[PDB]
Amino acid sequence: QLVETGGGLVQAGGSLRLSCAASGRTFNNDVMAWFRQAPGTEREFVALITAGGGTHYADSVKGRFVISRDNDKNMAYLQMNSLKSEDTAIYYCGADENPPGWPSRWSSAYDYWGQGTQVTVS
Amino acid sequence: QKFQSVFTVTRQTHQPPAPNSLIRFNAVLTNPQGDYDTSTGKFTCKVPGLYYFVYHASHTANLCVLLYRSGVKVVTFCGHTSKTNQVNSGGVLLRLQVGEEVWLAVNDYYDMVGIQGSDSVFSGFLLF
Amino acid sequence: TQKIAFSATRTINVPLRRDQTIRFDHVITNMNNNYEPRSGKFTCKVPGLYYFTYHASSRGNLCVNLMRGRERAQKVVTFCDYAYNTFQVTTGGMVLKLEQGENVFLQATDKNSLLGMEGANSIFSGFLLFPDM
Amino acid sequence: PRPAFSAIRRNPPMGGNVVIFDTVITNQEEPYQNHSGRFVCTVPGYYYFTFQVLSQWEICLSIVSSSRGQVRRSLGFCDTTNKGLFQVVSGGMVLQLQQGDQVWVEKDPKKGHIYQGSEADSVFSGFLIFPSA
Ligand SMILES: *[C@@H]1O[C@H](CO)[C@@H](O)[C@H](O)[C@H]1NC(C)=O
């Protein structure tokens, strides 16, 4: 199980930190990813972080979002800056226990999800 | 022994593989469980568990070798050369289930012409 | 049976300096969790015979030390491969008898052309061959 | 028995076609003979063997097995970059061995130069995969 927290109302230009809490097993050998779904369009990839902390970002969030994780506490985070109305979405945290040698940006690669958290920007 | 799995196969042909195609190793050195099929070029898992896969591929032009697992590209290693022979090597440990398939492929860099005496080999074995 | 095995690739491309541990951040396989992807170090909890291997993509001179030890790490071997400007893959391997708490890892030198890209992978792998007592 | 070894070149007898890896890193059950470069099988079964040898000019190497006096040159692997720069030629295979069978690495006398210095390493390794059943 994954549980997303931290969403809510932000004013544009502002910042927001989301958290994803993992339980059931240790997730220290998994890829963690953030995906998002705005109303009307589909689940787009946001950011992912490898087991050892390697970060990979969508082009739409490069320079603005920071993905992080804490292997001792089973936690992953999405620190969002310079927020825009296009970032309004439900944000979903996902985990891949069986990746290939390069981490995937496809939503079908992520074997567990949480109840998403709603981010609303201005 | 049916509850183990090991193979070593080689490639003997003057036909180069097509770009992006699976590499068929058509010649057996060891294959006592028949787990690599030398007519399809594919490993198919009979005994589930953790496998080590490794290759060494001779080439005299640019070669990238891709390891695939049931149609998903796992790893890629590339070696550039213009006339001289070198060996492209790569390998990976994978946990497999029954029926999962493993093969090697090339991408747009496809050369597998070794000089005489420089071979191309693919091996795999179940570890635990 | 003790199943101890790892395969890990490098997906960050920060330049390595001399004597830095080479981190392979992305875990393909890490059975019994004895590889630490935040560091790049394997740490032996089950003493016995292990095989370690790597394949490193490169675009220039690469030398890496294979390191071992409990307390102060020591060099087992150095592997060198000199590409001039162009994309290459190089490999090294070693069977080691390890005691409990021994670290095994790859260490960078001044010849630091090692890359981790989707089209040119760098991977570090290891597995237990035979445990002890 | 847990047969597994790794040996390197530091002060080898220079001589003939058999590539002698004189300096032993690991030699569990002592099957590798550092005087001769030959692995000698005691436990029948399936073994993996692999080498990573350093060259600066042209080299051709083979993994060779003997059974009951009869030699089997199974696979060859070459690097002909011929540039003065460190190149690694690597190869490996599974061999099924009976007791008394020998395995070694051979070099083409016609075309063959191994690096003779200290700053990087050439390695021959092998271990038992499954004993025979
Ligand atoms: C060579 O092997 C013998 C045992 O057969 C051992 O005593 C000796 O230390 C070894 N020498 C080297 C340099 O590995």
Strands A2-5 and A112-115: parallel
Cα–Cα distance list, D48 to B15, B77, B78, D103 (Å): 29, 22, 24, 11
Domain CATH code at residue C63: 2.60.120.40
Backbone angles phi, psi at A86, to 5 degrees: -65, -20
Asked whether the beta carbons of residue C37 and residue A102 sit closer than 8 angstroms, the reply is no
Contacts of C87 in chain B (CB under 8 A): 78-80
- The answer, for D59 touching chain C at a CB cutoff of 8 Å, is no
In CATH, what is the architecture of B1-128? Answer: Sandwich (2.60)
Cα(C63) to ligand 1 centroid in Å equals 27
Distance, CA of C7 to CA of B92 (rounded, Å): 6
- Identify whether the C-beta of residue A28 lies closer than 8 Å to the C-beta of residue C36: no
- The answer, for A68 touching chain C at a CB cutoff of 8 Å, is no
- The answer, for A59 touching chain C at a CB cutoff of 8 Å, is no
Asked whether the beta carbons of residue C89 and residue B93 sit closer than 8 angstroms, the reply is no
- Identify whether the C-beta of residue B6 lies closer than 8 Å to the C-beta of residue B124: yes
Contacts of D62 in chain B (CB under 8 A): 117
Enumerate the β-bridge partners of residue A38. Answer: none
Question: D residues 5-44 near B, CB within 8 Å?
Answer: none
Nearest to D30 by CA among D65, D2, D62: D2
Count of CB atoms situated within 10 Å of the CB of B71:
7
Residues with Cβ within 8 Å of D86's Cβ and at least 6 positions away in sequence, in order, are C80, C81, C82, D54, D55, D56, D115, D120
Domain boundaries, chain D: 1-133
Asked whether the beta carbons of residue A99 and residue C33 sit closer than 8 angstroms, the reply is no
Distance, CA of C52 to CA of C26 (rounded, Å): 17
Sign of CA dihedral D25, D30, D34, D39: negative
Asked whether the beta carbons of residue B128 and residue C53 sit closer than 8 angstroms, the reply is no
- Identify whether the C-beta of residue D42 lies closer than 8 Å to the C-beta of residue D1: yes
Sign of CA dihedral C71, C72, C78, C83: positive
Nearest to C130 among D2, D6, D119 (CB): D2
CA B109 to chain centre: 15
Obtained via which technique? X-ray
Max intra-chain CA distance, chain C: 49
Asked whether the beta carbons of residue B76 and residue A100 sit closer than 8 angstroms, the reply is no
Nearest to D86 by CA among D60, D61, D121, D124: D121
And the tokens for B36? 């690599």
Which residue is it, tokens 């898992």? B45
Query: Pocket around ligand 1: residues whose beta carbon is below 6 Å from it?
Result: D 22-24, 30, 34
Distance, CA of D121 to CA of B85 (rounded, Å): 21
Resolution in A: 2.2
A and D touch with 3+ CB pairs <8 Å, answer no
Which residue range is the domain that position C65 belongs to? 1-133
Residues with Cβ within 8 Å of D58's Cβ and at least 6 positions away in sequence, in order, are D78, D79, D80, D81, D82, D111, D112, D113
Terminal alpha carbon distance of chain A: 31
Asked whether the beta carbons of residue C88 and residue B74 sit closer than 8 angstroms, the reply is no
Ligand 1 atom 5: residue of nearest CA = D33
Amino acid, single-letter form, for residue A88: T
- SS3 state at A99: coil
Atom of ligand 1 nearest to the CA of D24: 14
And the tokens for C78? 């150095």
Q: How many distinct structural domains can be found in chain C?
A: 1
Distance, CA of D104 to CA of D58 (rounded, Å): 20
Which residue range is the domain that position A101 belongs to? 1-122
- Identify whether the C-beta of residue A51 lies closer than 8 Å to the C-beta of residue A111: no
Backbone angles phi, psi at A119, to 5 degrees: -110, 130
And the tokens for B9? 């196969």
CA angle B87, B124, C114 (to 5 degrees): 45
- The answer, for A101 touching chain B at a CB cutoff of 8 Å, is yes
Count of CB atoms situated within 10 Å of the CB of A93:
28
Distance, CA of C38 to CA of D28 (rounded, Å): 32
List the alpha helices (DSSP H) in C86-128: none
Backbone angles phi, psi at C55, to 5 degrees: -135, 120
Q: What are the DSSP calls for chain D, one per residue? A: ---EEEEE-SSPPP-SSB----EEEEEETS-EETTTTEEE--S-EEEEEEEEEEESS-EEEEEEEEETTEEEEEEEEEE---SSS-EEEEEEEEEEE-TT-EEEEEEEEEEE----SSSS--EEEEEEEEE--
Cα(D9) to ligand 1 centroid in Å equals 13
And the tokens for D4? 């597994």
Count of CB atoms situated within 10 Å of the CB of D102:
19
Strands of the sheet containing B101-110, edge to edge, are: B36-37, B42-44, B101-110, B63-69, B72-79
* Core vs surface per residue C69-103: b (16+ CB within 10 A) or e: beeebeebbbbbbbbeeebbbbbbbbbbbbeeebb
CA angle A43, A46, A52 (to 5 degrees): 130
Asked whether the beta carbons of residue A103 and residue C26 sit closer than 8 angstroms, the reply is yes
CA angle B55, B56, B59 (to 5 degrees): 135
Sign of CA dihedral A50, A52, A54, A58: positive
Write out the CATH class of domain D1-133.
Answer: mainly beta
Terminal alpha carbon distance of chain C: 12
Nearest to C127 among B74, B77, B127 (CB): B127
Strands A55-57 and A117-121: unpaired
Contacts of B73 in chain A (CB under 8 A): 100
Distance, CA of D113 to CA of D59 (rounded, Å): 6
List the alpha helices (DSSP H) in B23-98: none
Half-sphere exposure of C125 (CA within 13 A, CB side): 27
- SS3 state at C61: strand
And the tokens for C132? 């002890």
- SS3 state at A109: helix
Distance, CA of D93 to CA of D77 (rounded, Å): 11
Domain boundaries, chain B: 1-128
User: Which residues in C have their CB inside 8 Å of a CB on A?
Assistant: 8-9, 11-12, 23-28, 30, 33, 36-40, 118, 121, 123
Interface test with D, best of B2, B118, B128 (most D CBs within 10 A): B118
Ligand 1 atom 3: residue of nearest CA = D34
Q: How many distinct structural domains can be found in chain A?
A: 1
Amino acid, single-letter form, for residue D69: G
Strands A44-49 and C35-36: unpaired
B17, B19, B21, B25: CA torsion to nearest 10 = 20
Interface test with A, best of C4, C13, C26 (most A CBs within 10 A): C26
